Amino acid sequence: EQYLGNCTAYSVKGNKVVFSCANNSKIMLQLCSGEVVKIWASADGNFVRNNESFAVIEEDLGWKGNVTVKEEPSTYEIFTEQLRIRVNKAPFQLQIFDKYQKLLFSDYAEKGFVNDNGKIRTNKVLRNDEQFFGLGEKSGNLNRRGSAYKMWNSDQPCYGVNEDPLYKSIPFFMSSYRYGIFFDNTYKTEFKFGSESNDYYSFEAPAGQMVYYFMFGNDYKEIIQNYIALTGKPIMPPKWALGFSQCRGDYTREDQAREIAAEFRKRKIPCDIIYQDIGWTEGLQDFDWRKNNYNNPKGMVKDLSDMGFKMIVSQDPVISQANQQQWKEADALGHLVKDVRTGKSYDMPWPWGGNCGVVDFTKPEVADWWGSYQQKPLNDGVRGFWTAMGEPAWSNEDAVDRLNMKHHLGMHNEIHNVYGFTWDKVVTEQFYKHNPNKRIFQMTRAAYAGLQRYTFGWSGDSGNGSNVLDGWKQMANQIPVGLSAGMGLIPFWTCDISGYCGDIKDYDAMAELYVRWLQFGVFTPLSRAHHEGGNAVEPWKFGTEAENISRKSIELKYKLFPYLYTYAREAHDTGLPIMRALLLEYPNDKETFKLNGQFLVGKELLVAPVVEQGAVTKDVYLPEGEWIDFNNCKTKYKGEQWITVDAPLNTIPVFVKKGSIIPQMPVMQYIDEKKVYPVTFDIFPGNLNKETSFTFYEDDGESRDYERDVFCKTKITSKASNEEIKITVGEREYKGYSPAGPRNFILKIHASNKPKDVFAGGEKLKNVKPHVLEKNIEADFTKINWSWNEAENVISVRIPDSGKNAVITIKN
Ligand SMILES: OC[C@H]1O[C@H](OC[C@H]2O[C@H](OC[C@H]3O[C@H](O)[C@H](O)[C@@H](O)[C@@H]3O)[C@H](O)[C@@H](O)[C@@H]2O)[C@H](O)[C@@H](O)[C@@H]1O
Numbered sequence: 001e002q003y004l005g006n007c008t009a010y011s012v013k014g015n016k017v018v019f020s021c022a023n024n025s026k027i028m029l030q031l032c033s034g035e036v037v038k039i040w041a042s043a044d045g046n047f048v049r050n051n052e053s054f055a056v057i058e059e060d061l062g063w064k065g066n067v068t069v070k071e072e073p074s075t076y077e078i079f080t081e082q083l084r085i086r087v088n089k090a091p092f093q094l095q096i097f098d099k100y101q102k103l104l105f106s107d108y109a110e111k112g113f114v115n116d117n118g119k120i121r122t123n124k125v126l127r128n129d130e131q132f133f134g135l136g137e138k139s140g141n142l143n144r145r146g147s148a149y150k151m152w153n154s155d156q157p158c159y160g161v162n163e164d165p166l167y168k169s170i171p172f173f174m175s176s177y178r179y180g181i182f183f184d185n186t187y188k189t190e191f192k193f194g195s196e197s198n199d200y201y202s203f204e205a206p207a208g209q210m211v212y213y214f215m216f217g218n219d220y221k222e223i224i225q226n227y228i229a230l231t232g233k234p235i236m237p238p239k240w241a242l243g244f245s246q247c248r249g250d251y252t253r254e255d256q257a258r259e260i261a262a263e264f265r266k267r268k269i270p271c272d273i274i275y276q277d278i279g280w281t282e283g284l285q286d287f288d289w290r291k292n293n294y295n296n297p298k299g300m301v302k303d304l305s306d307m308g309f310k311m312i313v314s315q316d317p318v319i320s321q322a323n324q325q326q327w328k329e330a331d332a333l334g335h336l337v338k339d340v341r342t343g344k345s346y347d348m349p350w351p352w353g354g355n356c357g358v359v360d361f362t363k364p365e366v367a368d369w370w371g372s373y374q375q376k377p378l379n380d381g382v383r384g385f386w387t388a389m390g391e392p393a394w395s396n397e398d399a400v401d402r403l404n405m406k407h408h409l410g411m412h413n414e415i416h417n418v419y420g421f422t423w424d425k426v427v428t429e430q431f432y433k434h435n436p437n438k439r440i441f442q443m444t445r446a447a448y449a450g451l452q453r454y455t456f457g458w459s460g461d462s463g464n465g466s467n468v469l470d471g472w473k474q475m476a477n478q479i480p481v482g483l484s485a486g487m488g489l490i491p492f493w494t495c496d497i498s499g500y501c502g503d504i505k506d507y508d509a510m511a512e513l514y515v516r517w518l519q520f521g522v523f524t525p526l527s528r529a530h531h532e533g534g535n536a537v538e539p540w541k542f543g544t545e546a547e548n549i550s551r552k553s554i555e556l557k558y559k560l561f562p563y564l565y566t567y568a569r570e571a572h573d574t575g576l577p578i579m580r581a582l583l584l585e586y587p588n589d590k591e592t593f594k595l596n597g598q599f600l601v602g603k604e605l606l607v608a609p610v611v612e613q614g615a616v617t618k619d620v621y622l623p624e625g626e627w628i629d630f631n632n633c634k635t636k637y638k639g640e641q642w643i644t645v646d647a648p649l650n651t652i653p654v655f656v657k658k659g660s661i662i663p664q665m666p667v668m669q670y671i672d673e674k675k676v677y678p679v680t681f682d683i684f685p686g687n688l689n690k691e692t693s694f695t696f697y698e699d700d701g702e703s704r705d706y707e708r709d710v711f712c713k714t715k716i717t718s719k720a721s722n723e724e725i726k727i728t729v730g731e732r733e734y735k736g737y738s739p740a741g742p743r744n745f746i747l748k749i750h751a752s753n754k755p756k757d758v759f760a761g762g763e764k765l766k767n768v769k770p771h772v773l774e775k776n777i778e779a780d781f782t783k784i785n786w787s788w789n790e791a792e793n794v795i796s797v798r799i800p801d802s803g804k805n806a807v808i809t810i811k812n
């Protein structure tokens with residue numbers, strides 16, 4: 001095996017510096033910004049790759065001018081505003097320090113880059129206290145330190161608590177030393193975080209180029225901001241995607257869709273999306289509504305739409321050979337992935353429809369061809385897709401025959417991990433082309449880094465297939481799977497609520513596990529119940545107790561829509577997931593590295609779902625601050641401690657941070673059932689002299705105008721001083737979208753005692769009964785008054801949403 005060895009010279013080309021080392025080897029450092037360094041180590045010095053990055057869309061992160069290199073007798077030095085770089089000459093070693101000269105990131109000995117006949121590896125010093133997070137949608141504990149992980153998009157049904165690899169490959173990790181690494185290679189990469197030795201960690205590939213990006217941040221938020229500068233801002237879903245969604249393996253019929261739609265509405269269980277699974281289509285993959293299964297598909301979609309339901313349909317990436325018309329068409333056009341042994345279309349087995357052709361979404365002409373096929377259901381009013389089985393399915397590491405696949409852009413060993421990625425990109429591109437100024441809904445199984453530009457995600461076929469009742473630990477692991485997916489830029493994520501696997505032979509016995517799965521599930525952005533085949537898992541199937549609890553779980557998510565939607569926008573702007581590992585908000589608190597049983601939803605809410613069988617309590621770690629029970633709003637706790645709370649079956653432990661302001665809407669059966677509604681702001685005043693706020697984001701929820709910053713925002717501020725609370729409703733920040741109106745705001749200030757008076761500006765407001773404050777809340781927009789509820793300990797202040805600044809002063 002070959003190392004860089006001694007560096008004899010350097011050359012600068014603008015923001016790029018190339019160091020020449022032993023036997024034609026070279027290494028480039030490229031300053032994308034003061035914080036982000038592109039590093040390319042090359043065994044032969046040529047700096048070419050078979051394919052340019054599929055993930056990186058921007059390398060200019062604002063670096064100005066040339067890289068300045070200072071030569072010393074035994075080292076070279078490069079300074080940026082945030083970094084100090086030391087390059088040892090003999091032998092080549094790269095070391096990166098922060099501006100205070102603390103070491104962040106160092107090559108291990110002489111083995112910083114290792115080449116062995118095309119196998120490429122990077123070895124880095126591993127510090128005793130260095131922890132690691134990320135690598136996308138992967139199982140096990142949040143903290144990756146001590147374990148090894150592989151990138152090979154795999155199809156592992158009913159996967160275990162530690163199964164790896166899974167369906168997606170996002171080679172972006174973060175270190176507790178406050179940098180991220182994105183290893184910009186699509187082959188079967190492997191990451192070993194001290195799993196081989198305590199002295200070093202490594203990342204490697206069997207082929208391709210050693211190209212990786214070092215992304216410094218002063219915290220994890222900055223690292224993620226740097227990552228989306230490189231790989232793109234997340235697209236937002238249509239607003240209605242943040243409701244509740246329902247699926248089943250057999251959701252492939254008009255009669256059943258009509259039956260289920262009616263049942264949801266009759267039982268007043270809110271729901272926005274009815275999915276259809278893969279059997280909806282006449283064959284793989286013609287996008288024709290199966291004739292026996294749908295009498296009037298247009299009518300169905302419209303009738304469901306009139307009831308507030310949107311429909312999302314499945315697609316697989318293959319054409320069945322039995323689908324003779326489409327297969328022959330595809331094969332004759334050269335649109336199928338080839339077999340290098342024959343030069344002909346690769347002959348792929350598939351679990352349904354017989355052997356198939358794998359559609360080559362890396363071939364440019366395939367895009368418009370697929371686009372025209374997939375548009376058919378969209379012309380009937382379907383709102384998007386779930387793209388399943390793009391690993392491709394049935395192509396795990398041991399299925400070595402797949403390596404014979406030859407795609408337009410390369411061989412399968414290179415293209416496997418971007419097969420689904422390039423498919424998903426086509427789906428979204430073609431959607432944009434044929435459906436003007438509309439947000440796509442796409443939710444995918446297989447993916448690569450950068451997916452956030454095109455698609456959302458779900459965690460595939462989870463749960464226990466031998467006995468559905470034994471899936472508790474698998475359900476529990478969906479917490480860190482989802483948080484890790486979030487850190488890998490899947491902010492719009494869900495899992496199969498109930499799991500995918502296991503026949504439900506006894507609905508009474510399954511009720512507890514279902515209820516807990518849904519309680520967790522409603523705090524995932526794309527909350528979707530689904531199950532294999534004919535195993536019905538709608539929220540009323542588990543008896544009345546479970547139904548009532550599940551209705552309430554779902555109702556809580558709907559009430560929180562304006563809160564959640566504000567964080568959906570924040571995902572677009574900053575890359576931060578809605579579901580946040582506590583470490584993202586409390587990076588200095590090392591206890592957060594251990595937390596696999598709880599998470600933040602945005603910044604204000606801490607959710608700690610019960611995921612243990614028979615449990616009626618929950619252990620919860622509270623980070624810095626003070627924390628209030630969001631269910632009752634009365635019980636308060638000090639931060640930086642472990643507590644145990646009562647958590648019976650009907651209860652989700654949720655806490656609100658003291659100081660928070662939470663926008664909410666009334667219960668509705670689907671998003672926008674009421675196109676205009678009063679917005680309540682639940683305000684939990686912070687400590688004396690501490691100003692807090694929430695910026696309530698709104699936009700049209702459907703178009704791409706938000707990508708051009710067409711929206712409005714309303715900032716609500718709270719600040720307590722001596723026997724006084726000031727609540728400010730900020731002047732509406734108008735950027736080309738006017739909110740639904742006219743409407744009222746209700747400021748709901750949580751307080752121990754009824755105050756003396758409440759003022760709006762200089763003017764004293766009228767105290768009235770709760771009933772009077774509530775009267776004509778959706779019809780009269782001229783009343784400004786306040787009320788007290790002693791039972792709830794809440795001051796309500798009614799005020800029209802005029803769009804103007806208003807200062808509400810509460811005299812304690
Ligand atoms: O011809 C056999 C069969 O074909 C269709 O059903 C296929 C299949 O559909 C569901 O499973 C699809 C499944 O794909 C991946 O695993 C995803 O990850 C899952 O989310 C997704 O549900 C169903 O669950 C299976 O039971 C079913 O075999 C027709 O619909 C069938 O009528 C027909 O028998």
